[PDB]
Amino acid sequence: GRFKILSLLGEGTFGKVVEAWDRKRKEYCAVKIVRNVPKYTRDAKIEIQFMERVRLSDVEDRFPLMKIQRYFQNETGHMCIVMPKYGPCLLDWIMKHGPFNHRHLAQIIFQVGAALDYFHTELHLMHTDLKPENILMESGDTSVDPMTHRALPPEPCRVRICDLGGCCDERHSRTAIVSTRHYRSPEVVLSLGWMYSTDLWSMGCIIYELYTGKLLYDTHDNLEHLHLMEKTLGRLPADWSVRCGTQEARDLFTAAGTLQPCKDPKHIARIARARPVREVITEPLLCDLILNLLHYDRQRRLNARQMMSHAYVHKYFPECRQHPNHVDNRSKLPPTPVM
Numbered sequence: 001g002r003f004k005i006l007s008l009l010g011e012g013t014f015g016k017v018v019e020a021w022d023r024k025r026k027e028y029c030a031v032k033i034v035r036n037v038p039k040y041t042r043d044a045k046i047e048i049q050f051m052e053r054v055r056l057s058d059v060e061d062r063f064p065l066m067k068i069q070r071y072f073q074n075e076t077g078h079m080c081i082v083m084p085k086y087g088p089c090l091l092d093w094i095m096k097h098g099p100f101n102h103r104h105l106a107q108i109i110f111q112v113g114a115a116l117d118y119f120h121t122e123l124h125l126m127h128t129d130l131k132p133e134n135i136l137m138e139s140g141d142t143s144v145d146p147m148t149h150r151a152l153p154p155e156p157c158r159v160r161i162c163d164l165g166g167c168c169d170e171r172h173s174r175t176a177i178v179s180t181r182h183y184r185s186p187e188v189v190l191s192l193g194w195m196y197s198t199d200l201w202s203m204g205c206i207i208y209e210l211y212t213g214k215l216l217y218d219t220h221d222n223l224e225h226l227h228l229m230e231k232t233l234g235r236l237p238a239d240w241s242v243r244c245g246t247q248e249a250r251d252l253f254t255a256a257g258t259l260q261p262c263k264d265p266k267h268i269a270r271i272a273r274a275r276p277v278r279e280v281i282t283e284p285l286l287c288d289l290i291l292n293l294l295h296y297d298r299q300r301r302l303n304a305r306q307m308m309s310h311a312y313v314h315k316y317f318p319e320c321r322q323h324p325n326h327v328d329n330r331s332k333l334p335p336t337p338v339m
């Protein structure tokens, strides 16, 4: 009727993202076509609801969050979310062109930070499912570095945070399980209590992957995940065995309170095969940024404002300080979250 399908941009379990022509509004768009199934149709209606709350408040698109244009339920019942056409996810870039250089990484960290502190302290929502697959480049345009001849992203490297289906609020289920496991914080795994700070754990795992091209935790099992945290970051806190909130979580510890060892030969090999982030990240400011996003203490862990205001971003993205989203170029902001 109004939207004519032009391209297939991507496909998955959720459904499809297509490029479409808006006949009444005279432009190209991306349309998310959700599979016409009761659980996804309702999670689309919930996902839609978080999307109108972002635009209606940020009416002049100050933060790099996705901005819905329109939506409808098709004549075949598929939920259809009309949005601007953005580019490919960060995962697509790192796999074709490799990791970003310090400047574009700093620019990416700045933008996601600005969006996340707006999410956390202005809307009081958590994303809970941030991953390189749903951080999209604003544009798919490419430039060539004259010295290295390698591909450079647009300057600045604008990105957009997507996939608001899993957004949570300030009294989500306390033992609720959030995040894709690769980017799932330990507080969620063992049900110790989680809030905004779990989005910052995911940023730590994403920033590691954007810089190394490798997942920090390529794991499918809670206990192997926890040993990898121990080998990449240091000992798990001693009190953790008394505070887990579900039976499943506490049975990963001794009667004494230490981690039970894995002996699946696949998990013994992988932990032996992981090396500490501190030896992989040679840049000391980038290392400190990643390590304190992966802090076991949810309150000493960096918040979104500290991440975007980190010394690493100030060194490699110095024009950070002339951006209208820089903290000192804004009025006094709501207080940052406590954990």
Ligand SMILES: */C(=C\C(=O)N1CCCC[C@@H](n2c(NC(=O)c3ccnc(C)c3)nc3cccc(C)c32)C1)CN(C)C
Residues within 6 Å of the ligand: 009, 010, 011, 017, 030, 032, 066, 083, 084, 085, 086, 087, 088, 089, 090, 091, 092, 132, 133, 134, 136, 140, 162, 163
């Ligand atoms: C990377 C996944 C990825 O790049 N995308 C996730 C959804 C699939 C389509 C893809 N894509 C878009 N999408 C959008 O503009 C858009 C806007 C709003 N919401 C969504 C969900 C998507 N536009 C594109 C232009 C060029 C290339 C691509 C791929 C593209 C975004 C993971 N890899 C597929 C492995």
